[PDB]
Ligand binder design. Structure first.
Ligand SMILES: O=C(O)CCCC[C@@H]1SC[C@@H]2NC(=O)N[C@@H]21
Ligand SMILES: O=C(O)CCCC[C@@H]1SC[C@@H]2NC(=O)N[C@@H]21
Ligand SMILES: O=C(O)CCCC[C@@H]1SC[C@@H]2NC(=O)N[C@@H]21
Ligand SMILES: O=C(O)CCCC[C@H]1SC[C@@H]2NC(=O)N[C@@H]21
Lengths: 117, 117, 117, 117
């Protein structure tokens, strides 16, 4: 049940489609940051996970360039899909910015987002 | 600039193609871990970077299931490309595994990879 | 308002004293992992934070060895303290284990802990 | 053999002292960022590590406030010590700034440092 619309604790919107070959496709809208409207994403996931009750591993990427603006940055979300009464996706993310060699030490932010429907 | 074959410090081979629309397609082979042979990747990149000399931000994802085996895991690489005499892709990554909720605290590994020609 | 007893979402107990010298001293009890009983901690914090409302930056370290056990690992917590009606300490952590360099790529877990009163 | 002067790939200086009880004490100077001169550090380490050839786990913290300035920030380094002809300390670090509740998503940087003599 990964396919569908999800929201994280910041109020961002994540619209996902789960391919039977393990593909991920959709749209992302950030409530925060140097962004506006939708941005394209793509990723992959385990299409044959364990049935001992483990969650489903997954990942996806967004580059913050669209028709309206460029932050010159990209984010990847890595985490696992969890089912049951209340399904959620728990992730941790990295946000890298394009920088000069001078400032590369401070190019990457880390954090975590939690998504539900 | 990005399209082509790259190798990281572990012996792993990353074979990429960067579409002009910001898309990333290719193959990945890991020198290490619960893997063998090639795996499909996909990702995104800033197809309109700065002219001030900044690097080119990008990211990509790999789910470790192919026709030979399934580790039930996925990695995302977030970083930026740097060109010139010595071209490199400098990244940090997240490797998340499918876990029970009891062990979810130990579900995600962190690291860094450097890619060169 | 840092000194005192805190608990995180795992049910771990974090007992801290904030000295005026920017120092952090205390004990830690983990509800999870290769652990039993208390372990020593020590850290640092901004003893002169902004008055604009920003949080209080801080961090602390724990090596998992005590009279009862040795897990051959260490965790660092980095975050900020936030006061008011409901005070919290928001962190991200790095848990590193001793390994052979062949397995060095799988040496480091990343996570986040939330601490309340 | 953790005690001694080390430098990272940025040319920052790490002056460390390992107490017999698993304590770490010393000074830190950053070649970069919002800082100048020496800053106090404290941390812990595994004082009875495995003999199978694994590295020694360790960690330490620095709050970026001293007699000359205050960044309102702290960094924690988590990693392990590795001995031999090329003795090194391999780390990943987290750098957190004090922020408002609104800007917390951009409060924490991650990277990696390599220390040698
Ligand atoms: O500021 C940028 O460079 C682009 C916007 C970044 C928004 C980030 S991605 C991680 C986090 N989760 C969200 O929903 N928004 C922020
Ligand atoms: O072990 C697994 O479950 C999957 C194999 C992952 C190996 C990792 S991905 C990050 C790092 N870079 C590599 O080239 N290999 C490792
Ligand atoms: O090496 C071990 O197995 C013990 C690690 C302790 C469990 C971790 S430390 C980070 C996180 N926060 C907690 O309260 N527990 C886990
Ligand atoms: O917050 C600041 O502006 C001062 C901190 C300086 C950044 C650091 S800590 C990680 C990295 N390693 C190092 O030696 N210097 C930078």
């Amino acid at each position: 049940g990964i396919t569908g619309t999800w929201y994280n604790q910041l109020g961002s919107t994540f619209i996902v489609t789960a391919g039977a070959d393990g593909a991920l496709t959709g749209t992302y809208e950030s409530a925060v940051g140097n962004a506006e409207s939708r941005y394209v994403l793509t990723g992959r996931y385990d299409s044959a996970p364990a049935t001992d009750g483990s969650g489903t591993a997954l990942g996806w990427t967004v580059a913050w360039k669209n028709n309206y603006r460029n932050a010159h940055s990209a984010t990847t979300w890595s985490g696992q899909y969890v089912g049951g009464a209340e399904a959620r996706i728990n992730t941790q993310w990295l946000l890298t910015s394009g920088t000069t060699e001078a400032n590369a030490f401070k190019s990457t932010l880390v954090g975590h987002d939690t998504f539900t429907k």
